[PDB]
Amino acid sequence: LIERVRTDLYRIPLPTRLTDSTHGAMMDFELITVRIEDSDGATGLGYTYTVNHGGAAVATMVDKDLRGCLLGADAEQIEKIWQSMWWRLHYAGRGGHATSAISAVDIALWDLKGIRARTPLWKLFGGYDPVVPVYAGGIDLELPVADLKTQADRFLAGGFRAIKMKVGRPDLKEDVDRVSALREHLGDSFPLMVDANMKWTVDGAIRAARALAPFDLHWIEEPTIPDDLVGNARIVRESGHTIAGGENLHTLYDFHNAVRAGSLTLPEPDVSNIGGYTTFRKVAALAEANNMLLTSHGVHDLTVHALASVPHRTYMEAHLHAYMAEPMAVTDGCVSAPDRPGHGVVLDFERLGRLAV
Amino acid sequence: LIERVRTDLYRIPLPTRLTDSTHGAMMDFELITVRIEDSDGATGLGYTYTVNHGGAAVATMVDKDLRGCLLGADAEQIEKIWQSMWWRLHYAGRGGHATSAISAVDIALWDLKGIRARTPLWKLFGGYDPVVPVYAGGIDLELPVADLKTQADRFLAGGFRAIKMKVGRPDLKEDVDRVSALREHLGDSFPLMVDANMKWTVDGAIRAARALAPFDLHWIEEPTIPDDLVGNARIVRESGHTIAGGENLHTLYDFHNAVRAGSLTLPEPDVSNIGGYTTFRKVAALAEANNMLLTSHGVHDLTVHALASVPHRTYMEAHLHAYMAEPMAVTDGCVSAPDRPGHGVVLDFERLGRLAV
Ligand code: NA
Ligand code: NA
């Protein structure tokens, strides 16, 4: 039985001002942590985040709305709890911030299940291979080409053998020169992906795809808004590129629609907003059924367990480490899921207390 | 320019016996009010509500996240403000509770524009006919048959010439007997509609429709979950009934999807969660383009202006009045949009203050 649920909201400042085409101005991000304690004293950790806004709303949903579905319930019945939470915030919800709140809780419940079973989550889920390939997700749209190359050098020195850069500048010409510059810098066979963060129109995305074809990009992420199934399907049909998307999809149904409509060729769920490991694994099954690979976005320290338990995983985005006990090190383009019970992530809450909001 | 934005959250207690198939017993609805004041001292009123949970989260979004999109902005640029709010809460949002927060603000902005133009909203929007037909929407699933008819008499006494009852009981046989008793009670010329509130499975919904066909129901509302475009389109094709849906759709894109896939035959947007009047009117345009009628759900006091401005409107759902000054009276099955500047709704904030949370 669940005896305590602690929700906390922190504003973690970014070391550098990251920027993208849609919300560029990123100086800090909101972190919502959820700690769930059962009757035996074991505590599971879960967390989600937002960029610049909505953090307090998410924290409020956990604390005022979901708490009541947790206290007194058997934490071992994760699916049962997930459904109760989904329906608790269904009115006016069914997608949106409520799914991030649910993800944090779900993640904590699985952590708790892994701790009690004394086994790391990747094994608890089935177990495929703990060594997961990764890629550095740069948030560098407004970064000068010179510094873009430098950043790349740091990713390389850091162990990364795949890099993603931002695109979606006002003038396509600027993206073309930057991608061209980084391609010749990194080399011919180096995996290089781009992220437009929904910046282009359907026609603009296809136009951009033609202009970037010469550089053999590994994939183009979120060419336009995700809500447009028809238009994205058109981008898939005419761009001649792998089209990655999903960080902005928030329900299993969103992924079902996209897959069924062929509006993306590589699904990218974010365990912290798709509904937690529970929903993440279901999206993974959809991808496997459709003969698709599976990538991800965000919190790779938690995500590594999900991708280490599926056979079709590919480069995982590995863009809080300063506040972690023992974060994974990148070696030869990969990270290894830890073997401690649960997800193995431990945050320094004392140090985080300073950033509490 | 907007100089003040007051957000308040009230817990309006609800009587027992208000139940439907999936939301269960409704203990109370959380009312979020937004009052916006411009540099000339004019104030616009806007609001939205949730059932049982999520209210604090909604109020938090308006007060903490959207306030910054309002203060110092020209209230006259409703569409520009709408977009900035959509984008401010887009990460982890793009649907969900953020759309209800947005609707409250949008409704207040339109109210302010109508007050400043010294004209009622139905005229500001274009103007069709202020006399809008309505139907009584009961939340009576667990209500005994005898009480169901009793409630029906009260509705008739109230001026209603169309009634909706809840369906979705564990056993279809119960729904059939109840619908039959009400049909018998009202005469086969009386518009009787049913709301399953997403209770049935696709197969279950088709089976229910076959069983209820003898009673000539005006329409079946939300037979199953809204997320399932394919399944809903199948119900449309096989049920032989008008299929209404939309109260749980929260973006123009959701309505676009449903209409394109033919997953419903009668759209039912809710101005308080679809994005306000701004989005509601865009959904109405999609309905008109598709040769469909248009109905609605919730806050008929606000919604009356929307349906009074469109030619293809049909019965509007009607049923917070205890906190209103001049509530519209139902006469000969219709209500009349008042001709006062703006939406004309006035709430007793002194009385509501008592229920403030
Ligand atoms: Na993206
Ligand atoms: Na309904």
PDB file of C-alpha atoms and ligand atoms in Angstrom, chain A residues 164 166 195-198 221-222 244 247-248 268 297, ligand 1:
ATOM      1  CA  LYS A 164      21.565  16.076 -33.811  1.00  0.00           C
ATOM      2  CA  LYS A 166      18.577  22.240 -34.859  1.00  0.00           C
ATOM      3  CA  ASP A 195      15.354  18.767 -35.669  1.00  0.00           C
ATOM      4  CA  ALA A 196      13.035  21.435 -37.100  1.00  0.00           C
ATOM      5  CA  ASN A 197      10.849  21.411 -33.972  1.00  0.00           C
ATOM      6  CA  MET A 198       7.637  21.848 -36.006  1.00  0.00           C
ATOM      7  CA  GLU A 221      12.629  15.368 -36.740  1.00  0.00           C
ATOM      8  CA  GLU A 222       9.282  17.165 -36.389  1.00  0.00           C
ATOM      9  CA  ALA A 244      11.106  11.159 -36.664  1.00  0.00           C
ATOM     10  CA  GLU A 247       8.002  13.954 -28.375  1.00  0.00           C
ATOM     11  CA  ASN A 248       4.841  16.038 -28.657  1.00  0.00           C
ATOM     12  CA  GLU A 268      10.092   9.075 -30.744  1.00  0.00           C
ATOM     13  CA  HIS A 297      13.366  12.031 -26.481  1.00  0.00           C
TER      14      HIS A 297
HETATM   15 NA    NA C   1      11.457  17.798 -32.077  1.00  0.00          NA
END
